[PDB]
Amino acid sequence: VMTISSLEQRTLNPDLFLYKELVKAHLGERAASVIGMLVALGRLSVRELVEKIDGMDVDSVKTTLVSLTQLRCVKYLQETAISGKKTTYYYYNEEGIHILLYSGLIIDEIITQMRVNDEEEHKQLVAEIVQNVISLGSLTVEDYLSSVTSDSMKYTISSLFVQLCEMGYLIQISKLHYTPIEDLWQFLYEKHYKNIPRNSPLSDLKKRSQAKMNAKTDFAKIINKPNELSQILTVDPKTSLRIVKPTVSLTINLDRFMKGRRSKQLINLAKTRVGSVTAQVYKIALRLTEQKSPKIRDPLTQTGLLQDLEEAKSFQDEAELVEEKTPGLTFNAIDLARHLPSASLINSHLKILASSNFPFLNETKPGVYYVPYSKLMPVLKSSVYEYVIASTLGPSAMRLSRCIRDNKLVSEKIINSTALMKEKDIRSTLASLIRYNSVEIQEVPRTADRSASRAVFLFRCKETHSYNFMRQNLEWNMANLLFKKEKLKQENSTLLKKANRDDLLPSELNQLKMVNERELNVFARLSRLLSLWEVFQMA
Amino acid sequence: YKGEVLGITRFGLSKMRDSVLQLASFEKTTDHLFDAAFYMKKDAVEGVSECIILGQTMSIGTGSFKVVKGTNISEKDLVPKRCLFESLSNEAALKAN
Amino acid sequence: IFVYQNNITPSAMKLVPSIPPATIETFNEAALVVNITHHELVPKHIRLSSDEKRELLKRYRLKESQLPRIQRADPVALYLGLKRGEVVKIIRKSETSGRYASYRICM
Amino acid sequence: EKAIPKDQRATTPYMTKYERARILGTRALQISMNAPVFVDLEGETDPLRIAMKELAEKKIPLVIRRYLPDGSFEDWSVEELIV
Amino acid sequence: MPVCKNCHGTEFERDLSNANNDLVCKACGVVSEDNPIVSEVALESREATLNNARRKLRAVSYALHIPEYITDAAFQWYKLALANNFVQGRRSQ
Amino acid sequence: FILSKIADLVRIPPDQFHRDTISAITHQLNNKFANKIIPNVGLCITIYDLLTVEEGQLKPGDGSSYINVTFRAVVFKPFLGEIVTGWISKCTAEGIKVSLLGIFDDIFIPQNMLFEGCYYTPEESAWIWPKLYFDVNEKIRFRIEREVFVDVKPKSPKEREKPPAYALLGSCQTDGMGLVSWWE
Amino acid sequence: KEVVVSETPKRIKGLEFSALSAADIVAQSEVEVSTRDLFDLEKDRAPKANGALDPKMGVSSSSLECATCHGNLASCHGHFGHLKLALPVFHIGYFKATIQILQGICKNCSAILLSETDKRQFLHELRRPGVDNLRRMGILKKILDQCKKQRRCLHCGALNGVVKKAAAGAGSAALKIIHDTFRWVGKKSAPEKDIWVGEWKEVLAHNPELERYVKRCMDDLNPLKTLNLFKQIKSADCELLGIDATVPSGRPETYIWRYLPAPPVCIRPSVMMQDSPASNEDDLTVKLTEIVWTSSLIKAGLDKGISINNMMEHWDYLQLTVAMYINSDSVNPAMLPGSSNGGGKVKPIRGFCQRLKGKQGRFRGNLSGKRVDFSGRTVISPDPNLSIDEVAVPDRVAKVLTYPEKVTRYNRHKLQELIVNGPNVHPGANYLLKRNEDARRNLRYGDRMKLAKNLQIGDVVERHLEDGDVVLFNRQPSLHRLSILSHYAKIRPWRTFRLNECVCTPYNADFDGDEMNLHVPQTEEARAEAINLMGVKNNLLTPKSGEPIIAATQDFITGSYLISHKDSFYDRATLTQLLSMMSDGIEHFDIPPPAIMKPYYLWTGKQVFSLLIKPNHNSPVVINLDAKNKVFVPPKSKSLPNEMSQNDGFVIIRGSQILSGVMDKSVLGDGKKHSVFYTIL
Amino acid sequence: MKVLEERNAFLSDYEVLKFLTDLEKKHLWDQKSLAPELQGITRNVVNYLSINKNFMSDESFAELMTKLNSFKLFKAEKLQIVNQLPANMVHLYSIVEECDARFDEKTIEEMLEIISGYA
Amino acid sequence: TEGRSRDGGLRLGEMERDCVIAYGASQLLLERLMISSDAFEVDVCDKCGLMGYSGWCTTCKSAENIIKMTIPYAAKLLFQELLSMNIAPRLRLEDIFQQ
């Protein structure tokens, strides 16, 4: 019926769907459909692909596979069973194509390092750098700068140079680095039950906890090995100053893009509940401490290991106090009052830190002006969701959905009491909500076994399902919006390549601005939705 | 036939037979079909009580052997013929390269 | 092979088979009294070799599977200690037209 | 899984009695479509009976194609193969 | 109602003799339908009031020994007089 | 013009069994193709040669003798840029639709490489040039470039034509084009 | 012009089963049922605008055309329809499935609960090429229940108990599914339970009337809940739960109803008007035409009005109809009915799962058991003067029971005559189908003659059933390989199927009042597939014991005995006439020298029976044998053979003469192996 | 049905028209016989292939290759010279890449000379 | 249709049909339970096998990949009465010839 329906393209593709359009909208061709198989069908082996895609065996698979790997679009492992030989298993890389999915706000990450050089081709320079770096995947300043012209100013060219370090940009990607975290927890969970020097036969507990402990502490430096090591930072060659190790291949570490994009959201939450001035103080206050907060890195092994009715807590509370403690000494006791506009006498203007009270910050060593951190984010994140259904379901929806938050599993009779309106409204702004999930239902039978009109109903939250009703936001228009970008490319499909290789006509000029402002809208959307989506996937 | 001793019973024909139309055609009808779809059973059309449904021919019995007529052909008549339009104009492309 | 006496504990069987390069083979003492192959009915069983299989599967031009199967453990199998995917040539005898043989595989 | 050369044959050289079935059937059906007849047609009509009248002479020009189980094909002439 | 696709005949005879049940025209001979496929074997304000009218209708109906016929004859008259809303406010009897 | 190797399934009814094989084969091939056009290659004419005919099968429900062969036949897809005889037959103020006798006119040559100096008349001539117009049925050398393959057979009961199943296009950038006596 | 038409003869390989997706249905259906029922009673009789029955969904009678593709009944196959259905609901066929698919996943974060390599462990096993469907099912039983014994999740941190499918078998709440907390296990502090006991603190202490009275309800998974649960169970596991993810069927979403497709009207034939505009319904159309109602109720509901407690009983009732729709299960667990009830307690409420299921609804009887065409039925009477392998067929049912003939060459001089008879005499045709495949013709047109003077070589005529076509012949509930036989049909008068008695035993037709079935084949080969294969003489034996199943019974035995009797004699008159009566004429007998001579002449009944086997000298029957016919008295062990037993004895045939013995079943009685008929055969 | 080789053997028409002609001698021979429907194309394609020759030869095909093997014409105009624009002036120059360009006098003229061998 | 009165036509039961199987008569059986009773054309789309009328597939507008063929009408009626109920035996296909 009319095909403008747009159901096939719509409903039946969750999760996986985003990827195989992204790569399709990005790499495309055969290079895409492989990942579509790879996500959907799980871990997969080189030969086994060809039994399905019909992709001309060991041709596309190999070529497109490495075509992904330098862009790290796959998770990569190889090993052998006890029989012998060897085999390779794969996955869809991490968040992976995610790197592509932003790439614009990764362009915006200039603004942080943008300081000390403003309104320059130096801007355009480092932009050209990064937009070449992600596109080309792994880079080396030796091969890149080598391809870059000679007879210019080396330490002036490199832009980053002494900057390559910062928090973001790049790190060596080393071997098992992008070997999947979950599985390297298994390989490292060897060596411990694997090596038990016949300690005692009794108490597998002494075998167990020690293993996990050994598994934890040995894992610690594993992610910290790439985190920072001076092999990059320290080197200072002859006739020069401190250099990186351009001998090494590096790739953008998205964790400090996680942190960076996120701290902006922590702002826009704070830029509400305080005054714009002290807000700005909070705005730069993160810039110093936005380094060491694990943030989207802290979940880490929260994936891959069975949780516990206890040990899961001993994992939580560990993340609660940790860096608020040791990096707490890296965190803000007395700031430099870095730049600031406020002016004249600037010090008590700084004492305003206490003006932040609820619902975040506002904890310290007793009376040095300071903020909690590793515990902050947990007591911060949980309350980052804010209004996710405002100007979508109507404001009336908030008040009771907010009310359902305070108490729990509450019945509409007393919802009609605490909250208030003619029931004629509740049965809309509530019932209309439940279709979008959130509230769900509790129900209990009364004076019946279980029946139709023989019981009472209660309403609850289950914020998991709530906080999960917005992962449709992934499948939502990040589904459609990206099509919009693609399926319109066919309007000028013959005109596009004409306009690219031409640099005329009335109708050519006619729809240029049309399709273009069109685009700039579709990516404006993508930026907005992206900014919202920045929350629910982690933190 | 399979190691375990079973069969003849609603449970019996679920011993081996992959055909879910006959396992549908026999005893439990509805839920052989539903179960069959939920696990997306492939069910190649093979046996007799299977084919008589689709009404195609039968694998066993008279339907056991395809029958064919000989063409009585002389492959001496199968050699192509041309005056080699190709061969003459070929040598114009052999130079300057 | 060792044997049980009376009890058989799923504790033991929970992880019994811990040796991939080798195996273990377990009997319950009640199950060994008279050897089954020696009984009356059970016809003589022969375990043909690896390569001896290939000859067979060439005679009838057959893949693996698609054969009459003996479920491992079968009383006979354990006594004869078949492994996964072997072929026991069974020589049976019944007076109909005479003696003959059929083959079974261990699945 | 190709054809098997006629020199080596494992199969019953006699008629399988389904031979007599489908061969007469198909041959008859062809005769019903106005196809030539290779036996002297005595005074008589209708397709099937003249087909019987034909195979009695083993003049039927067909080839029965037997499939072994694996798809190793086969061939036999109708003339060669014996009642 | 259809026409012979050959003779353009305007009249058909069904043929019930030999249990074919043909359908063919005298001037054509061409059939038309062979194989004569032949079968075998809530809550509303107005409709409810119509049911009630049926009940009070049947009730008084046989009481006078009137035809089952004439009642469903007159029930329609009630449905008609409902349209002009003559029947709204006057004693139902 | 050129030759090509295609595989197909020939169905010979019993009738021809008296006639020798290759003749009946070729015959059913012709009754199948002749004028008919195989798409995304371009139309055939006749069946030139024959080869690889093997023992033909017989299906159970019919009894028609079935064979499948492959061979080479005479198609028309000459090449892209080319000059050949033709003329105006059914055409607009835009570039003419050229015609060769008895085969087809599918070829509509637009207005592009065709000489810039021109003026249209509704009478007889399409575009008269600074060198002049041209005649129907007259031998006319024209150049072709692009061909279009569209089958487009969305036969619909709601719909119960658009037949440009095969067509070519071009224009003439050199002289003597559209009228041969300009050159020669 | 004319792009080439390439078509290939094709046959089926396999049936891919699957659930239709959500979207795919409307991607088929022409028109939303949506709307409502009413069948617009106005203007035409139920012209049925949009709604349940819509012309562009299909048609019913031969009345009006089909919209989408018109051409009424014969030419249109029906077309589906789709139903916007507010809120989703369980699917009674996939229900217990849905309890498996939901059984094996932690309902919190909605990821497959089994973990690490052990996931890969099973995954590897499923992909080994030789795996049967049985190994699929069983291995799935082993992979599932690992869930129940996985006592908490892996990366969610939450836990799960067992999901019990509340109550049983009722259909009242039975489709509601409940799963929340097993194993309180005492001293365990469950942070869940903790937050649990803490939640009801705000109700018990608030609205105490419930308190611990109605307590211990666990919680439920609402079907609406279970959708927004399933939609995160995708990729990764996917087929580990048994569903190959080919990315066409969209993973365990479809299995709960969202768009309910409406079957074509040709599945839902509107019953004949049957005398006045009241036009009998069919039951499903009443069902779904109610589903539209109780849906659009909730659709207009839930938008503005109604209420939470006056909602879920509706949407429930929806669940009970849609499952009620496709299966039996729930009948009346005090649920009470909807539109068009009357409250009469009518038990046969369904025309669905049953029509596909048991008895003879369809699957068993109407598909594998198809009722047939070109047939006949009649009582029976013997006709022994008729040979074996014929059936006397009463011509009055021969006139209407026809066999097609493609008139070819040889066939003309019969057939271009055979029409001119016309089918009110016996040896003629009735229908005629010319070469141009138009429709067909018959007698009622007159003409013929000049018509029959054309008769091209491809034309099809339909003969009456002549003398010697191939009739296959059947008895009763058919015990074994011998019921269906063929016979060369022979057309006689009176009216009944007259077989030859020697074939009484395979049918065990007693004559009496029993009834046979005639089936003519149609395609020109099926004849040769009956008479030449399945025929009498080739089935003369029986498949089970390899035993003659057709022989003399009753009269034919005992009559032979009286001629077989040592006491009897015959004279050249009586003999000669017998031997003539034995084959009605037609044959050449060489009278053997008379058994006894001089006092007159006589031939012994043994001889006059010998000639039965070997009438001429040119018949190639040379036999020999020996046997014991029953009631065999022993001789004295004095007698070396059993030959000399007092009342005959061995029937011993040599040189194809009978030497000694009365016959009497045994030798000529089908039962034992050593039989004159069996040996000769 | 399945197409094994799409572009296979470039076939010009020199004796190909003679091949259609021999095919026509087989069945129905064009016009005069007394004195399949396929015949429609026969009379058609035979038409222009015959007339521009008049407004043919056989062994000239063998005479055709002689100096024709000495050029850069590739396969395109190399077959094209055989029929259309019988190798004269700017006609032959109007098609093939670098038709005059590099090679001029005897190259374009001896085209007029060789066609005098046939035409 | 059943019995006399209505009309005629007779009954091969699940019990009886086996008989002609034991003989091994294929073309007879197919000549009985197929041609003689309900002979019916269906247009199936090779891609995503489903039934369609005349030209169209209607799940994917095509009138192209569809192949005509014949089939017992009861069998179609089962493909709908099934496919109405949510399930789809989607038909694969293959050509008869070339093995």
Ligand SMILES: [Zn+2]
């Ligand atoms: Zn007519």
Ligand SMILES: [Zn+2]
């Ligand atoms: Zn229609």
Ligand SMILES: [Zn+2]
């Ligand atoms: Zn979980």
Ligand SMILES: [Zn+2]
């Ligand atoms: Zn399709």
